Design a protein around this ligand. Structure first.
Ligand SMILES: Nc1ncnc2c1ncn2[C@@H]1O[C@H](COP(=O)(O)CP(=O)(O)OP(=O)(O)O)[C@@H](O)[C@H]1O
Ligand SMILES: Nc1ncnc2c1ncn2[C@@H]1O[C@H](COP(=O)(O)CP(=O)(O)OP(=O)(O)O)[C@@H](O)[C@H]1O
Ligand SMILES: Nc1ncnc2c1ncn2[C@@H]1O[C@H](COP(=O)(O)CP(=O)(O)OP(=O)(O)O)[C@@H](O)[C@H]1O
Ligand SMILES: Nc1ncnc2c1ncn2[C@@H]1O[C@H](COP(=O)(O)CP(=O)(O)OP(=O)(O)O)[C@@H](O)[C@H]1O
Ligand SMILES: Nc1ncnc2c1ncn2[C@@H]1O[C@H](COP(=O)(O)CP(=O)(O)OP(=O)(O)O)[C@@H](O)[C@H]1O
Ligand SMILES: Nc1ncnc2c1ncn2[C@@H]1O[C@H](COP(=O)(O)CP(=O)(O)OP(=O)(O)O)[C@@H](O)[C@H]1O
Lengths: 302, 303, 302, 302, 303, 302
């Protein structure tokens, strides 16, 4: 819905947005939204996500896909009406994203998902990428472990010529839906095959906001291997604007720069990570706030 | 409809167009068109806007979407007939835009929406853009507040990987329709995701005229930072010709140039704004008439 | 239909074409075709024009749109049959353009629409364009007034972010149809939004011939963007879709008018001076040379 | 159909092909094929041509369009079966082109259509084109007159912003069909608007063979005005390979080079024309065999 | 179907493939496959080829097109099932190409179609092409005559602005189907108009294998004289990989180089031809074994 | 399905992935998955693969295509539901790939398919490619023989102008399905014709994972044309759609083998020598080092 503001209520929102990342307890937003999801009546649609064609499939609070749901209308606070109808497995009426209000008056946040090694990490989508020798798959799994902390992290596998990997996009979004409904920390290997169908475009534009509204983090690897002007700019756009955070490799092997958006038109934060390998190529991130401007960001985006 | 003119009636129109921006009371056009909207019979379609596919959804005066409306014909002054029919939520007959006459004989106006810091601002669409370090989201909200004045301004959120943001285009146009039906000052964050489907193209071409006819201002942020020849020229065209005003960043951080179209084939006006940040990144525009030619405009249009 | 010629009847046509522009009374062709239109039986289709999709809508002599019309066949002089049928608002059978013969044996003309300041102006489409500081919207309205003379000129508004402007292409062609059925002098602001759907392409290719056959003039502004696809389409429309061309020059206020006088005839050029009065109203100052194709192509660069 | 050959019967064909251009009486082939057309039973389809969509409309021997025709099968000499069926104005079964055998065993010819000023001219399509100041519309009409000789030549008008011009492609092909069924010499002004829909592509590939099989000549003007690599190469291909002859302007104003294909894999012939203008821009070709190689042809094709 | 191999049975195949070109009697494969075709039951589909749309039309052993054929299933040796069904003139089930096994265990062959002037020529598709002054149409007819020897060669005409030429693609493939069902030596003039619809793409990819499996040769002219990067690379690909042999003109007028694939991953053979013209432009090839590497091939492929 | 991990269970997986390539008995994974396939109930769908259109055909354990199969739902361990339905030969519900779990908890492996000449070879897809004089078809057959060892290898033929070759894509995928259901070592000649329809794109993205999950190896030849669109698609398929890469070098007869050993594991390189015998039969001469991404990208240029 839309929101009305004056000087006073806008200052309150900016202060609440600041708190969502800087002062709130790591993972609290996730716990809150779980409660919201739990309070929903049984079989009521909570989430819809786009399939390859651009149609959308719909899920309830138990990550069960809904085949049939009679049309129902909900009048929101602003006066706008939300209609939802599902027929033969697909959304007849409604929109893509959260079909129930997870956020209320609190929007444009970057809720804090976890803290690790003296740094706070944002929910939403984190894109792991860059050129050079530093490996992306070992990094996503190490971050997934670290930010999961006490909790296990979920791995969604997609589009690699290795054993057990799904290559069907429609199963991919079904995995992603379920992961976001049930887990705070999610890893995606890999995002290469989506980078084009309507579903693939829908996902790039939908997932960061879906994740941020849930308070979960989706950590996807994206190898920018191609030299093609069409596809390489789509990697830059997804890295710059479709993602909530960006983890990118550097000149020095093992080293990475993390770029975090802290909220709606707020300062973007940067820090550096050191890493090293153990047995069977398991990566560990070494444990032991500065802002970045847009000219620094565009320089890094190469 | 079409309008017939001679030397005498054309001079009258140019003089009335001048008044709409230069002399009329800020926000008066908006108040007028509200009255017009209020006088419409209940459930009668007043506005239609295009969805992703290029179909269109339709609304009444209370920003309520219309599912069913029997075909009805209205004979305008020029002799042209307007037909409107809605079936299963979508427009079967009719056009995109205002389905009732908000403007009458007064066309090509650029109605003054507000005054702030010694400068008058136009209704229609304002595109906020440019390259460099100066931030666009803090600027749209500051302008939204300033031009709202005594009134609150409405925020439509779209296509950012942050909490509570809608990313479905069909909900976006539903938010925009409602905002324009009910508020003088509107902010859009952000216009990146529309910049391509028929709906997205329809919106770029429809919104400025919709806004200007209502006497409300839509203030949209558009980051041009990507470097593809296809998409960058579409940002220039939208900035040059789809927008009623243009707010663009400069070399000096915090500083912006405002370029305003004052009316149908009238002089384009430029002025400069200074800004600074307060607590939690809230931007304030500092408080305390010159024309710009097309070669100056094209020079500025490079970013 | 098709026309058969020998040396003698071809010389007659060239002489009649010469007269249509050079010697006939300004506006006489328009008056003639009005009479033709008036003589048509009531509700009989006279004009069809293409909508966004490439379908076409149809009108009668009173600029009223026709929803239903039973199939009817007309055998022309050459033996060719013209069939017209309208169903549910759209043309089922027939063609785009004038559905009744306005021209007879007299074709490839550039009928003279008006005279002003010692120069004759052609009916058909006039494209107003060029780069630099000289303004196009003030010029189309000044020309519209001047060529209207004793008569008012009709303004069709399209695709500008200003109050009261239509942005729906289907209403645009409905305005244009009506203007051409009822007025000698027509202004279009602006042609930028058509410059792509089938309707938009149909209009660029249809309007000059529609106008020239009626003996009315359509004066459209077209601001010429730096994309190779779109810029060449502006050159083609300026070179070959238009009957006349009005283009700005180095000196502010000054314009060159390039007029096609008929089917494979000499193209004529002259110069205009202009200045502004109050509320930005433009006046054209009151007080025959041919142009070759190498001069034309030189001028066509902007 | 297909044709079987040995050394002896192939030499006979080459000798008969030589005769079709070099020794046969000008216009004889046209007279022959008229007789063939006349001998066909009434209402039997003789010609089908493609409309904008790629569907095709069909005609009988009197250039009357056929709405309905029951499926009929004809067993040719080679054993191949030709099926023709027309329903609701369009071809349900059959092919584009001549639906009856005009040529028999005699194929790959360039039948001589006329003789004028000491030179023989081929039937098929003649494309008139080139850059520079020499005008194309005056030239097509002068050639149309000259090659028509005792007979009038037919003019098909298409896609110019002048009075009486059709701009609907479906009417254009209906005019062309009729012209070819009833006249030896045909002029087309202009071919710019086809140069893209399936019909337009079909026409470029169909018309030369249709014309050559009838023994009529279609003389089309094509202004190569565009500077676009996509469209300019399509003008070169149409000029090189879709046309039977090529008339192209030169450096010297008034002067043209005619390039004629004399038959299936035969020598291409070149000659030069002088021209000048009279009253109301009527062009006269001045009255008072050499082969061209492929490297000379490609040089000229610029 | 698929084929299983070990070292021993693979060596046998390579030796049999060698024989198909090098030692077998010229035209013997064609005679064999005729016998196979003759043994088929009446009206049973033997060949399907793609039309402009990508649908396919089907023929029997007498080159008669089939309108109706009830679904029938055939279990091959490998266990795979071939289903064929024709309805309303078009293939409802089945594939493009030979609908009956012409080849059995002997695959990847390159069967010898004829011998002329001390050189053996392969069945399959021969593309005649190149730039310069040497003419392609006189060459295809001369080769057609020479390789036909005692037998007449069939000419399929397509897409030239000359008398009696078909320009409809659907008739073209009907001519080609019939020619391949009934003749060892076939000429196509010209392949320019296919060089894009699904049928045209299907044909480029289907014809060489169809011809090679029959043991007939299709000799097509392809003028590459146009200069567009999209279309010129498609001429190179068709010349390099869609054709079984390649005949290409050289610097010296009248002279041509023939490049022959002798079999599945075997050595490619090159030789040179001299030619001259007689009466009414009839070309004669003058009468009285070396391998070419891929770098030599790619060098030659530039035109 | 998705998999949950902590530090401990992730280390176990990496150790199991290491074993799948490095320590497990060559071909053991293939033998296991055969057993799995054998245990399936008769006529139950086990594999679906995409046809030219993007629809998919489905097979059972005996490589017999399924025309009809009533909708059936299977609840997996993670809670996700797999639905399969086949109607009129095509998949109505379900996904592309293995329709039964071949891999369980063990995913992202590169199961060892064979050992030959002191080196271990991975299942999945091996792309054989490169520029220069070294021949690809003789190499795929030599590798097919060598890795087959005691077992015969299956050859799928596609898109060459030679006798007995299929050129229909729908038969190609039917051959591939069957080969993978029944054989450990598979050769494909050739992959040029797929390199574009939805099926062709689906296959490039599906085959490596299908093969790796089965524990069979598909060895395809791909000759790399000088078009920027198509050449980058060859690089992407070589870099990321394939499990291993065999590429020719400067020295004739010599090849470099690049092997992915598992999910985000070290890529291994070794060199092969070859020579020809009689009738062009190639023999690979009988008698671990890692490669970095900058070395890989250097090699990827051809
Ligand atoms: N023990 C070890 N020591 C150093 N580097 C290692 C390692 N194990 C794995 N890596 C690194 O991890 C990389 C593999 O991860 P990525 O960079 O994501 C490419 P990928 O995922 O294997 O395939 P892709 O290119 O298709 O995505 C290897 O190239 C290697 O540099
Ligand atoms: N306290 C502060 N001081 C200086 N600049 C600030 C600030 N708070 C916010 N900003 C500026 O606000 C900008 C954020 O808005 P923008 O960059 O214009 C659009 P966005 O929110 O980054 O979406 P995008 O990344 O998809 O473009 C930053 O570039 C930053 O420079
Ligand atoms: N009084 C005045 N003095 C000088 N120039 C004037 C003027 N009034 C108007 N103009 C010129 O006329 C121009 C307006 O017409 P145009 O620019 O050609 C159409 P536009 O308003 O830019 O809409 P567009 O987006 O379709 O181009 C202005 O740029 C201005 O320079
Ligand atoms: N009396 C005369 N003397 C010399 N040249 C003349 C002439 N009358 C006509 N022409 C020539 O004929 C030309 C017109 O024919 P074309 O070259 O075919 C262009 P067009 O047909 O007028 O428009 P197009 O460019 O849309 O096809 C003029 O440009 C002029 O050069
Ligand atoms: N008597 C003769 N002497 C020399 N060359 C001859 C000849 N007769 C014919 N030719 C050659 O045969 C060629 C004609 O065939 P090609 O050019 O290869 C295909 P085409 O018939 O021209 O169709 P295209 O123009 O669509 O390519 C001419 O280029 C010409 O050089
Ligand atoms: N006895 C031999 N000695 C040397 N080289 C041989 C040979 N036998 C075969 N070759 C080489 O192997 C190559 C054949 O395999 P490739 O070229 O890689 C596939 P192709 O036959 O060109 O079909 P393609 O069109 O799919 O590329 C020949 O170019 C040849 O150089």
């Amino acid at each position: 819905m839309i929101h009305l503001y004056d000087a006073k209520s806008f200052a309150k929102l900016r202060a609440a947005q600041y708190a969502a990342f800087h002062t709130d307890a790591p993972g609290s937003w996730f716990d809150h939204t779980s409660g919201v999801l739990e309070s929903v009546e049984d079989g009521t649609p909570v989430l819809a996500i786009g399939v390859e064609s651009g149609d959308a499939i719909v899920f309830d609070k138990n990550a069960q896909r809904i085949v049939a749901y009679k049309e129902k209308s909900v009048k929101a606070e602003d006066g706008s009406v939300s209609v939802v109808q599902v027929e033969n497995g697909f959304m007849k009426q409604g929109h893509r994203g959260w079909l129930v209000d997870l956020t209320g008056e609190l929007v444009g946040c970057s809720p804090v998902v976890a803290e690790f090694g003296g740094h706070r990490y944002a929910s939403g989508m984190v894109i792991v990428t860059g050129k050079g020798n530093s490996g992306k798959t070992p990094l996503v799994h190490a971050l997934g472990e670290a930010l999961g902390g006490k909790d296990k992290y979920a791995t969604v596998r997609f589009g690699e010529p290795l054993s057990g990997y799904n290559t069907d996009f429609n199963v991919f979004v079904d995995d992603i839906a379920r992961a976001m409904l049930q887990h705070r920390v999610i890893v995606i290997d890999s995002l290469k095959n989506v980078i084009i169908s309507r579903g693939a475009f829908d996902l790039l534009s939908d997932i960061g906001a879906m994740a941020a509204s849930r308070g979960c983090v989706v950590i996807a690897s994206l190898n920018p291997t191609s030299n093609d002007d069409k596809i390489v700019e789509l990697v830059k756009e997804a890295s710059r604007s479709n993602s909530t955070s960006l983890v990118i490799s550097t000149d020095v092997d093992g080293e990475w720069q993390v770029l975090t958006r802290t909220g709606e038109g707020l300062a973007r934060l940067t820090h550096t990570l050191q890493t090293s390998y153990g047995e069977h190529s398991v990566l560990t991130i070494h444990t032991s706030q500065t802002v970045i401007k847009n000219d620094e960001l565009e320089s890094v985006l190469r």
